[PDB]
Design a protein around this ligand. Structure first.
Ligand SMILES: *[C@@H]1O[C@H](CO)[C@@H](O[C@@H]2O[C@H](CO)[C@@H](O)[C@H](O)[C@H]2NC(C)=O)[C@H](O)[C@H]1NC(C)=O
Ligand SMILES: *[C@@H]1O[C@H](CO)[C@@H](O)[C@H](O)[C@H]1NC(C)=O
Ligand SMILES: *[C@@H]1O[C@H](CO)[C@@H](O)[C@H](O)[C@H]1NC(C)=O
Lengths: 13, 626
């Protein structure tokens, strides 16, 4: 649908 | 008259038609004021004759398969306040004649095949409230200057389009706009300072563009501002202090920019901030203490920056924090025990810093912590026995530190622990039997420590898929009970003092793709059973041991092995058993007692002559013509 708004996906180790 | 879907004017004239969810197909009286044919699976062009219903105030064709252009004639309908064309296959330009719909309020073009530019004519629509054209991949060009003329604009979104250039200063004229969403587009240049004039702005989503320059200071004058998503752009300069003046702001995401300067002290005034993401920037300074005043913060991600100093103790004041990511910074000092007062913490990642001292035991009292990632620091001391208290611990990485002493037995208490990496520390003593109690343990990496003693099949939990004990002082014999681990994929025991024969029980680990026994004291003959594990695919490393005898004939069944290293042993006989392994990329046979001839195949010819020179009798032969 085109994506809904979202934040930066968080990355961890 | 009264039939379902049909509505009538008081004079008895057909007024509205509404049809939905009837799973039709194919293509598709003038008093009509409202027409909804929606979610009908309709195909074909929009009939050009639509423009003929002079009384139409509403047209909803959305959620169909309609193709072709948006007929210019659609714009003959002067009384239209709602045009809903979204979720179709519609192509072409948005016609200039759009400016002809005087009282248009709602315009939904989103999720189509549309192209070309937003016409300069939108400026003529003075009642327009919502314009959503997003999800048109080829909608292109700059947002026209004339957009500043739609004074009733509330919601604007162009997201996932090819919209480009700078946002016009005109945007500052939209005094009623609540949401500007243009994200994952082609936008470049600076956010215009005039955006500070949009006094009703709540949500600004500019993320995933090329936006450059700095974040305008004027954004701190938007008092109704709730969410600011500007992540993954080219943004430069310092984070504006004035942001601390937006009382309603709950979400700030600046992640993945070029920002420099300091995290502003003024952020302490934001009483509503739930989520602060600064990840992947050039931010320096220390985490300011006033940030611990933000009482509602759930998510703090400051990872991948230049932040220095100590993690403040007053962090205990953030009682709702579930997620704290400061990894890959310059943080020094102890991890504060007060961090354990945030009882909701799900994930802590402090990896890749200068943190020193002991791991404070209190952190292990957190009952909801799934992820503890402390890897690559200067941490030392013991792993606290309190590690057993941490009930939901799933992923634990302590690797790359100075940790000393024994792996505490109470780790056996953790029934959800999946993944544990303690590699590269100073750990001593034995791998504790109690670890057999971690029922969920899959990945276990103890490599590069001082661990010693023997190794028991009883000691390891049978769900393990990955074991790396390499580079330790481990000794005695590889236990027969190794065969109890049938899930085990990779097993790396290398650089230990391990001894004896390889137990035939090894054969019953049927998932094993990688076996490294290298640099040990193993002796005797390589068992035939070792060739009975057809899952061996990635590597078999037997090198730097005392193995003797010949390469077992069963080795021909190693049809999936890509890498084989037997080098630096006492092995004798010839290589014929290996000649048919078509998938073997890498063969190290050097420093053995091998002898005999190898065929002139390009494979063997790729073997270094120095490798044949370190053997007894090895040479490449040429076959006879016959
Ligand atoms: C982990 O659990 C242990 C055992 O229940 C806790 O140790 C006890 O703590 C209380 C005070 O809170 C003392 O009265 C007991 O004498 C302690 N017992 C033992 C056997 O040590 C420990 O505090 C918990 N750790 C964390 C980090 O919360
Ligand atoms: C096999 O083991 C030795 C000793 O640990 C190691 O140095 C060598 O690189 C390994 N061979 C391969 C192919 O990885
Ligand atoms: C054997 O050869 C492979 C490939 O050249 C190499 O990676 C490995 O280090 C070698 N083994 C030893 C013991 O040096």
């Amino acid at each position: 649908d085109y994506s809904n708004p979202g934040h930066h996906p968080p990355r961890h180790n | 008259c009264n039939w379902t879907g049909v509505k009538c004017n008081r004079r008895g004239e057909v007024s509205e038609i509404q049809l939905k969810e009837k799973q039709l197909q194919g293509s598709l009286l003038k008093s009509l004021t409202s027409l909804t044919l929606s979610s009908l699976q309709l195909t074909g062009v929009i009939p050009k004759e639509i423009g003929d219903f002079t009384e139409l105030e509403l047209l909803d064709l959305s959620d169909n398969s309609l193709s072709g252009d948006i007929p210019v004639e659609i714009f003959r309908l002067k009384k239209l306040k709602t045009l809903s064309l979204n979720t179709n296959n519609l192509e072409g330009h948005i016609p200039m004649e759009i400016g002809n719909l005087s009282g248009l309020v709602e315009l939904m073009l989103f999720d189509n095949k549309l192209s070309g530019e937003i016409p300069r004519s939108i400026g003529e629509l003075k009642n327009l409230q919502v314009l959503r054209a997003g999800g048109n991949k080829n909608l292109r060009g700059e947002l026209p200057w004339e957009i500043g003329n739609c004074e009733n604009l509330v919601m604007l979104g162009l997201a996932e389009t090819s919209l480009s250039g700078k946002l016009p200063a005109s945007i500052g004229n939209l005094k009623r706009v609540q949401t500007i969403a243009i994200y994952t587009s082609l936008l470049s240049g600076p956010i215009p300072d005039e955006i500070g004039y949009c006094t009703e702005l709540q949500n600004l989503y500019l993320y995933q563009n090329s936006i450059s320059g700095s974040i305008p200071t004027t954004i701190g004058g938007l008092k109704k501002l709730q969410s600011l998503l500007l992540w993954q752009n080219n943004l430069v300069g310092k984070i504006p202090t004035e942001l601390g003046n937006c009382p309603e702001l709950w979400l700030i995401d600046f992640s993945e920019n070029l920002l420099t300067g300091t995290i502003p002290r003024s952020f302490g005034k934001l009483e509503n901030l739930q989520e602060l993401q600064l990840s992947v920037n050039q931010i320096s300074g220390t985490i300011p203490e006033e940030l611990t005043n933000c009482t509602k913060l759930t998510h703090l991600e400051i990872d991948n920056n230049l932040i220095t100093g100590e993690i403040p103790s007053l962090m205990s004041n953030l009682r709702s924090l579930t997620m704290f990511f400061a990894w890959q910074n310059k943080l020094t000092g102890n991890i504060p025990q007060s961090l354990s007062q945030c009882r909701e913490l799900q994930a802590i990642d402090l990896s890749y810093n200068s943190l020193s001292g002991s791991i404070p035991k209190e952190i292990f009292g957190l009952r909801n912590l799934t992820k503890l990632l402390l890897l690559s620091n200067d941490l030392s001391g013991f792993i606290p026995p309190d590690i057993g208290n941490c009930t939901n611990l799933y992923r634990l990485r302590l690797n790359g530190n100075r940790l000393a002493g024994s792996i505490p037995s109470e780790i056996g208490n953790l029934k959800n622990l999946n993944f544990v990496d303690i590699s590269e520390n100073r750990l001593v003593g034995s791998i504790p039997p109690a670890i057999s109690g971690c029922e969920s343990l899959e990945f276990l990496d103890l490599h590069t420590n001082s661990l010693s003693g023997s190794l028991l099949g009883t000691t390891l939990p049978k769900s393990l898929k990955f074991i790396d004990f390499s580079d330790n002082a481990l000794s005695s014999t590889l236990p027969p009970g190794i065969g109890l681990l049938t899930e085990l994929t990779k097993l790396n025991l290398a650089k230990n003092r391990l001894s004896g024969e390889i137990p035939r029980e090894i054969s019953t680990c049927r998932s094993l793709q990688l076996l490294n026994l290298g640099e040990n004291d193993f002796s005797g003959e390589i068992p035939d059973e070792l060739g009975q594990i057809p899952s061996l695919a990635i590597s078999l490393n037997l090198s730097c041991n005392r193995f003797v005898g010949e390469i077992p004939s069963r080795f021909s069944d190693l049809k999936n092995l890509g890498v084989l290293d037997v080098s630096h042993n006492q092995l004798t006989g010839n290589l014929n058993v290996l000649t048919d392994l078509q998938n073997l990329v890498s063969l190290n046979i050097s420093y053995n007692d091998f002898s005999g001839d190898l065929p002139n195949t390009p494979f063997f010819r790729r073997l270094p002559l120095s490798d044949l020179a370190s053997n007894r009798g090895l040479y490449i032969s040429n076959a006879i013509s016959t």
